[PDB]
Amino acid sequence: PGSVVELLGKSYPQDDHSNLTRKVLTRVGRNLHNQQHHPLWLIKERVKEHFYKQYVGRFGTPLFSVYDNLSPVVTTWQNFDSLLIPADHPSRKKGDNYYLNRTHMLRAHTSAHQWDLLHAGLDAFLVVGDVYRRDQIDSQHYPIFHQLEAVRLFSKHELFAGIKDGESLQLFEQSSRSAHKQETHTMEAVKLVEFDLKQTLTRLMAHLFGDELEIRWVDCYFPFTHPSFEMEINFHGEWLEVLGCGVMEQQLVNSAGAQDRIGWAFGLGLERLAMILYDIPDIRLFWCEDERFLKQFCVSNINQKVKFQPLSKYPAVINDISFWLPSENYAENDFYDLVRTIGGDLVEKVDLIDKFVHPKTHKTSHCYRITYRHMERTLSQREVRHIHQALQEAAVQLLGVEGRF
Numbered sequence: 027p028g029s030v031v032e033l034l035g036k037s038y039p040q041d042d043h044s045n046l047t048r049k050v051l052t053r054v055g056r057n058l059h060n061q062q063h064h065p066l067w068l069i070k071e072r073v074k075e076h077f078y079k080q081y082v083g084r085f086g087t088p089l090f091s092v093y094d095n096l097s098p099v100v101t102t103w104q105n106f107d108s109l110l111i112p113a114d115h116p117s118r119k120k121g122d123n124y125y126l127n128r129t130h131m132l133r134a135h136t137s138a139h140q141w142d143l144l145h146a147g148l149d150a151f152l153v154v155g156d157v158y159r160r161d162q163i164d165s166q167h168y169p170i171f172h173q174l175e176a177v178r179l180f181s182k183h184e185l186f187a188g189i190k191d192g193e194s195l196q197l198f199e200q201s202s203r204s205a206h207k208q209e210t211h212t213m214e215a216v217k218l219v220e221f222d223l224k225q226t227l228t229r230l231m232a233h234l235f236g237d238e239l240e241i242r243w244v245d246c247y248f249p250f251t252h253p254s255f256e257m258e259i260n261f262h263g264e265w266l267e268v269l270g271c272g273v274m275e276q277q278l279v280n281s282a283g284a285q286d287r288i289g290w291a292f293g294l295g296l297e298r299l300a301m302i303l304y305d306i307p308d309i310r311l312f313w314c315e316d317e318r319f320l321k322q323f324c325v326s327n328i329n330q331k332v333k334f335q336p337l338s339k340y341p342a343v344i345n346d347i348s349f350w351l352p353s354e355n356y357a358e359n360d361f362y363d364l365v366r367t368i369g370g371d372l373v374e375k376v377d378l379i380d381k382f383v384h385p386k387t388h389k390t391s392h393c394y395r396i397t398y399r400h401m402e403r404t405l406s407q408r409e410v411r412h413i414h415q416a417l418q419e420a421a422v423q424l425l426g427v428e429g430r431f
Contacts, residue, residue, distance in 0.1 A: 031126055033099060043125040049367045050124055050132070050158065050169060058312060059154050059172045059296065060094055063324045065304060066172050066296045066312060069234070070094065070154050071328045073174060076233045077152065086187075088150035088178060093139065098156055099126065100133045108141035108282075109250040110275055121357040124158045124169075132158035136175035137250060137293055140274075144282035149179045154296075160359045164375040165308045169366060172296040177274070178226075179287040185218055197288050198276075205245075208252050210276050215288050219273050220253065223290040227257060227271065234303060235259075250275050251291060261302045268302070269294040304334040308401060310371045311337075316402050342374060342399035343410040347418060350428035351390040358392075361425060365396070368417045372410075374399040391430060 031038045031046055034055060059066045077090045102125075106118060116122075117134070124132040133139075136153045143151050153175035161167050186192030195214050203209040207216045224243065231239055240260040244267075248254045251272030258265040271292030279289055297309055306312075311319055322334055358378065365376055373396060380393040396417075398410045421427050 033126070034097060036099070038126040038130055041127045043120060043128040045120060045160075046124050046126055046132070047363050047367060049363070049370075053170050054098060054132070054156075056170075057095070057156060059156065063320070064312075065300045065306070065323050068323055068325070068328060068332070069296055069300050069303070070174065072234060073230065074152070075328065076230050077176075080229075090150045090152050090176065090178075091148060092152045092154065093143070094152075094154035096139055096153065096155055098133050098158065099130060100138045102129055102131055104141065105131055105133055105135070105138040108278065109137055110278060111249045115249070121359040122160055124160060134159050135293060136173040137291070139175065140177055140250070140291060141278065141282050143177065144179075144279065144284055147283070148177075149287075150177065152176050160363065162359075162376070163362050163365060163373060165310075168297070168309045168313075169363075171309070174294050174296060175291070176293075177289060177291045178222075179279070179284060179289040180219065180222075181287055182215075185215060185288070203252070206253055208273070208276055211273070211288065216253070216273060219288055219290055223271055223273070223292070224255075226290075227269070227292060231257075231259070234299070246270065248272060250278055259302060266298070266302065268298050304332060305336065306334060307336060307339075308374070310374075310401050313371060314401055318402075337401070340400055340402075340404045342397050343405050343407060345396050345398065345410065345414045346379075346393060347396060347414070347421070348380075348391060348393040348430040349421060350384075350387070350430055351392055352426035353389065355426060356390075361392075361394070361421065364420055364424060365417060368420055369396070369398070369413055372398050372400055372405065372413060389428070392427075 029040050031040060031044070033051070058064045059070050061067050074092060081087045081089050111117060123134055135157050136155050139153045143153065155172065156170055157173050158170055160169065182197045185197065186195045189195065196212055197215045198210050199212050201209060207213055231241060242258050242265065244256045244258055246254050246256050248270060251274055254270065254272030256267045257269045258267050269292055271290065274289040274291050279287060297312060300306060301309070318337055323332055325332055362376060365373055375397045377395045378392060379395050381391060383390050398405050418429065422429055
């Protein structure tokens with residue numbers, strides 16, 4: 027909280043949008059995805075190896091150029107408008123993002139780099155990086171994580187090369203948008219782009235997991251693609267989403283200067299994939315420096331199948347914290363940052379279990395249940411009490427809540 031933020035050597039003026047915390051600052055520049063022998067680095071390398079070999083083996087295949095060191099500070103234009111995300115879209119809320127100010131932010135997804143890289147005239151590339159979101163707290167959510175983006179453009183003659191009379195076929199037309207295609211795409215083009223997209227991803231998952239994995243495609247919606255899909259993997263009895271993808275919105279591609287191309291794009295969550303691939307039970311593990319964890323990933327070669335031996339699970343301490351929200355001033359994600367900041371990685375989860383309005387006061391009451399559990403050891407009742415009482419006091423000062431208990 028101030029009037030000027032300093033980040034990665036650059037300075038940004040503060041405004042009504044600014045909400046970066048010091049704690050997030052301690053993580054910007056860490057780049058686990060570039061840290062040799064880190065699990066996220068390992069996935070990245072294996073994905074790179076797949077695309078390299080594909081390029082070397084098949085004539086048809088593009089060279090995917092890799093960008094894994096792009097600054098995470100981007101403009102709201104890069105993060106949102108270049109991707110056709112409407113001005114009133116929920117993903118833009120202050121409570122969901124880390125804004126430096128109205129115009130600059132920590133990127134919420136690697137898709138923030140699609141337009142610029144297209145605009146540079148690239149036909150095929152990967153973007154790998156840390157991304158940032160303000161979200162709830164549990165074993166599957168962290169304010170920082172890592173995505174890998176892929177983008178692949180086709181020209182008409184390239185897409186239809188393997189068809190006999192292929193030069194009478196076209197990429198574009200002027201029809202209507204349906205659940206199956208955009209208004210300026212032909213169904214001929216879309217069918218082939220979709221097939222290529224899904225075949226590519228299916229081969230990549232095979233490369234990563236072997237042929238035993240059960241996967242399914244789910245139809246979905248993104249502003250920057252259409253048609254759009256999520257890929258789910260069945261894991262521990264449950265269908266889990268691992269990536270989004272689809273056919274790039276032609277307006278996005280045209281505006282970047284590739285008016286003669288149709289393309290696909292996908293974004294994959296590295297932590298998710300890594301937790302499934304190595305059976306890592308808690309996302310906080312990526313951030314610990316415990317060798318019992320890290321030593322396991324020091325492989326001779328990136329293809330050496332690592333057999334992650336899960337650490338013991340330590341007991342938790344559970345504490346409730348109740349208070350009265352301020353008179354017309356409060357976001358649930360605000361309290362969660364205060365938790366991240368005081369409780370750090372001692373906190374496994376926070377659940378809002380009760381809320382109600384007191385008639386006389388008119389004030390709203392929140393009750394949160396906080397699960398304290400250390401990834402590396404047993405927490406004492408003593409140390410938790412102190413962490414807990416510190417968060418209690420803080421919430422009073424900084425969030426203008428009323429100690430209810």
